[PDB]
């Protein structure tokens, strides 16, 4: 076992799991889900004594809410069995335990509803509504909604009740930023886009509205059920180990077409 030395002792035997997922979405103008997947990693940070037999249990459905892995690679320390149990003697400190992909039953934490109105050929009226879709006790953090503007843009007027927004002319986008937002809510932004005149013939190819966010759950639906520690020499049971998990779900590509 060349990934863990043999001397290791801690009074405080503790581990931390980070489930880190990036959720990706392409949505049609009329709310259809054109494409969506999650990529995830589980990172383990183990401060455990001796050489212990860890067993990682999740809400895998092949084994309540239960979920569907398309595929995954593991860290060499993992004993490949097909009971679908995850067994290993972990390296010390921090390492990547598994990497995975999911396409089915994904929680899309945000819904984006765009509305666009042409006003002659002098301006565009734009309304965008975002809906948080997740437990109300949970807050999303670091929410950005990026609304692209045409190249013939004289100037931009925006109102929003939540957040701050700026027209960023060099980037050709309005950028709305919200610090915090809770589950099962709505917010909207209105903007009026002043146009320059332009070659009437070439039309605007409206790129998507994209979002960034971070959420404290796994959009795949993954929940950690247990992490079991057995060290058969040393005199500490499983229930002596202090165990922690956190979830950090972040947008990848998360685009809604208008």
């Amino acid at each position: 076992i060349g990934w863990r030395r043999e001397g290791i002792k801690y009074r405080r035997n503790e581990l931390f799991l980070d489930v880190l997922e990036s959720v990706n979405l392409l949505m049609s103008p009329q709310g259809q889900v054109l494409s969506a997947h999650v990529s995830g990693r589980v990172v383990m940070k183990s401060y455990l004594s001796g050489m212990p037999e860890c067993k990682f249990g999740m809400n895998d459905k092949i084994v309540k809410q239960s979920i569907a892995i398309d595929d995954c690679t593991f860290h060499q320390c993992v004993r490949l069995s097909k009971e679908r149990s995850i067994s290993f003697i972990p390296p010390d400190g921090e390492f990547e335990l598994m990497r995975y992909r999911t396409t089915k039953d994904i929680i899309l934490p945000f819904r984006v509803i765009p509305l666009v109105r042409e006003v002659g050929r002098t301006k565009l009226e734009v309304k965008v509504v975002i809906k948080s879709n997740f437990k109300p006790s949970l807050l999303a953090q670091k929410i950005e909604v990026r609304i692209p503007t045409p190249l013939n843009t004289s100037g931009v007027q925006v109102i929003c009740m939540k957040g701050k927004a700026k027209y960023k002319a060099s980037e050709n986008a309005i950028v709305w930023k919200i610090k915090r937002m809770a589950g099962m809510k709505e917010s909207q932004i209105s903007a009026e886009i002043e146009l320059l005149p332009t070659n009437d013939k070439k039309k605007w190819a409206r790129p998507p509205i994209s979002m960034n966010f971070e959420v404290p759950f796994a959009p795949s639906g993954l929940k950690v059920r247990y992490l079991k520690v057995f060290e058969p020499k040393l005199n500490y049971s499983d229930h002596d180990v202090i165990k922690w998990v956190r979830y950090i779900g972040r947008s990848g590509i998360y685009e809604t077409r208008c």
Binding site: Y226, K243, W244, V245
Partner: peptide, 6 residues
């Protein structure tokens, strides 16, 4: 943000 595994 870290919670106990129950």
């Amino acid at each position: 943000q870290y919670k106990s595994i129950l």
